[PDB]
Symmetry: D2
Subunit: 282 residues, 4 copies
């Protein structure tokens, strides 16, 4: 994945047929290169319809998800493997090139105590099996580090890399998110540095999930460090103008992040494209 993309919560709450149409049409208005589609209810996704829309409008895609509690990999690894296999198949069927996000646990997952080796061992077994299935469908898997309040297992670039190393697959990458790094990284550039050998995808998300350029993220540090490590993967926006219901409780958007998609896309995407030009990103 290359260039600029948008997580489709910018435009649709649910990836149903009307929502897919609405999101793809909106993406065309902004000349982005790809979209990121939530894979939160895999049997409900009409893959033939989404593939038709993507190919007609010359858009690339990937999918992302968080695991439902019934299938959290850390404690119910057999259910997690079965869920990920279905999500991988649907991602591949619609033409998506990867399945990323919190593929190792829940959005809002917490035991109340620090993560344990038994949990990480379960996650490793799940991701090893999922990565084999992904290879059979020709897609990659991404592991997104999220903040301490959304998951207790993988919060930093360094923890994400440790899991990629624990699994020992060749088709799992690290996915970072500036909103999460703004909380978790001891200096935001350190997350990028720690993840550099595996970093293929980054959510350029403002500190309050609003408009990039108008929060507390350290954008100049972020873009300088991406340029320094030779980043050439996907640059994707993530702003919860709409909230997918299956993850709303974990994402904690209790008030509007911005007025509407026109504001976030009209002000945020030019800011990010201009910063990528300024620091010479590949």
């Amino acid at each position: 994945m290359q260039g600029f993309g948008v997580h489709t919560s910018m435009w649709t709450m649910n990836w149903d047929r009307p929502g897919a149409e609405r999101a793809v049409a909106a993406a065309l208005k902004y000349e982005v290169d790809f979209i990121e589609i939530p894979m939160l209810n895999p049997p409900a996704v009409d893959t033939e319809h989404t593939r038709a829309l993507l190919e007609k409008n010359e858009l690339r895609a990937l999918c992302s998800l968080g695991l439902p509690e019934r299938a959290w990999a850390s404690v119910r690894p057999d259910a997690a493997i079965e869920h990920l296999k279905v999500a991988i198949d649907k991602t591949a069927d619609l033409g998506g090139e990867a399945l990323s996000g919190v593929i190792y646990g829940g959005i809002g997952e917490r035991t109340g105590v620090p993560p344990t080796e038994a949990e990480y061992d379960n996650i490793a077994r799940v991701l090893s099996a999922a990565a084999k299935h992904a290879k059979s469908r020709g897609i990659e898997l991404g592991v997104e580090a999220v903040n301490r309040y959304e998951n207790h297992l993988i919060n930093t670039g360094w923890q994400a890399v440790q899991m990629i190393e624990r699994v020992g697959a060749d088709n799992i990458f690290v996915h970072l998110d500036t909103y999460h790094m703004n909380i978790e990284e001891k200096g935001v550039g350190n997350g990028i540095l720690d993840a550099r050998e595996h970093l293929k995808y980054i959510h350029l998300s403002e500190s309050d999930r609003g408009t990039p350029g108008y929060g507390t993220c350290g954008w100049d540090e972020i873009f300088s460090t991406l340029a320094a490590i030779g980043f050439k993967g996907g640059l994707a926006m993530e702003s919860f103008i709409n909230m997918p219901p299956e993850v709303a409780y974990g994402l904690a958007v209790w008030r509007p992040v911005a007025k509407d998609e026109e504001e976030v896309m009209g002000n945020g995407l030019p800011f990010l494209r201009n910063k990528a030009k300024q620091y010479g990103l590949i």
Copy 2:
């Protein structure tokens, strides 16, 4: 109105028993602070006279802070919240504290999955009006600390805190901001200070990862410049989660160390904050 620099004593003591109070006051003297913030996990157990004597002997000012336990969350159990707050207010006053602050309007862990409602805010306002009257009768103030979306769904920004203060209509409730929470919640960190400017009397100076101030993602120059520009008169209180007791830490989503040790946090973070306060004239 607290003045100068202080510290939240969690780095030495979250259980304010007799040895814990001595340990915390000894730390405050070591680091030469102007005041301490005393956590009240269990208000009834506090020895008010021992603490009062310690503060007076050492010319240390203090305030107290807490969050409501689930049995007393104001949004849903306002009668129980009033009863909890009355005990904490009396203990604060009797030990010589000048205010009770923190998440006095709810608890860590509140989340409905939807936006806060008028019904919830009505209950919070009734609780804070009763608590404010009790605090007035004991000659202290109350502070409302805005915390981030994941800890509570009701008061996350300076502007929401001010709206609640206006809803209650008391004269002795102020806004308490926290740079760690503002780093998530405010649309530009200075905007929390700007929105709260008529009521801001206290700020937690905490790094973005609860570690060492100066070494994270908080915008310290914007924070201190904006405090100076609004003419901030109030407590500058350092807050770090280093050495917090495990069960408290886990409740605040601390799953891994926030910093190497106290010598990193206090040896690097306190001078950073004092230097910034001098730089921008807050001193």
Copy 3:
């Protein structure tokens, strides 16, 4: 002045008839509230044409200059007074509301040692005379602090305020410039703080004189501090893009500051207006 404006150097440094027309046309294109008119040669300005242009287009204006060497106030105060009187009359007659800039000296002053009381006494005598003339024509005067390399006399907000106190006039204000403050102020907000009782005008200029938003100025600190002191004066964008070479060389522009006007105005003005909205200056 209130709202947003532009220093017209991007279209005109020589305020002749076609230059005035070109600048007012640009002001309307970018929907600004006011223009800052450079006065390289005050005697040559057609005051009636400019006044009619401003009035017809509902545009407000102020003027600015730096003193030429024959009239540097620190050493040639009588000549400085004569030069300022002519500029003040031209400003008032064209409908301008203030004369600002380096009205206390010139670009290129440098003794090699710290500024002296004798220098400051001559400047104060000049500004006292000029302020009285300005008052008789109904306009104010602004003192722009500029960096150490351009002039050795007034570099910080606090130095500007000390000169306002030394003169004792009631119609002189402080004019700050983010490009100069980025060098001179010990934390950029401190220039605004120190000048808070007298600050009525600010040049919003990137650190390299290029595109605001894309440099090393601390824009969030600048706008938050302006909001916090209750700033109600002019927000004026300044960029050296397309400056006439002669003038550019005198300001040490040895290479392009930006790609073109489309970059500077198309990226820079929205950035600044968005920041002003974000922090409630509007």
Copy 4:
């Protein structure tokens, strides 16, 4: 190959005379820096055996820096520049210095009034080629420091510095950046580091007003993150003009104190920079 932390000796002495050398070396030991950077502005006046003995006695490494005097500006008087640089290189080597850096291609305060020309750059390239051979004969390297538009019109950015190193084609010339200069010249400070990454061996960590690092407008987190990202392994050196060498004062434009004294800059600035280097995993 300088490494670790060092200080430009204007922190402590206005001239590198015998009393000034003793003062500066003594102060450097008090702060446990790894090296000092000695101005080479009056080469025939430097007592090289005295400085060598002090450095060797106190286990301190050193390099030298300069700006060319107008009589020997390389862009217009290249033969004089070569003769001046040969003397400066010889004295640097005699006192045990490992490199000669700074504005070795022109003046501090050099200005024609118009943009730089190819003929000026041809002269500089010829000078630097000849100087680089002499430096190799004495076993030291040369550094080219980009400085801002008001101090020199020829080399202002990392990218311009690299273009000159490539033009000269000598393998013993490195790029030397300075955060005070990059704060003005680089379109985003990290771009200077990125542009110079193949040749960057030395950086002045100098605050935006030449005062205390951490208390100005330099983007330190961006600076340190980008240094770490490019694998920087050279010298990290402070530059604060507590004292002003007279031969460059007019060009450096320090008209008012940059800070209270050296105790304030070293006491607050060096720990800040060391802590940032640790934070981003340089040191």
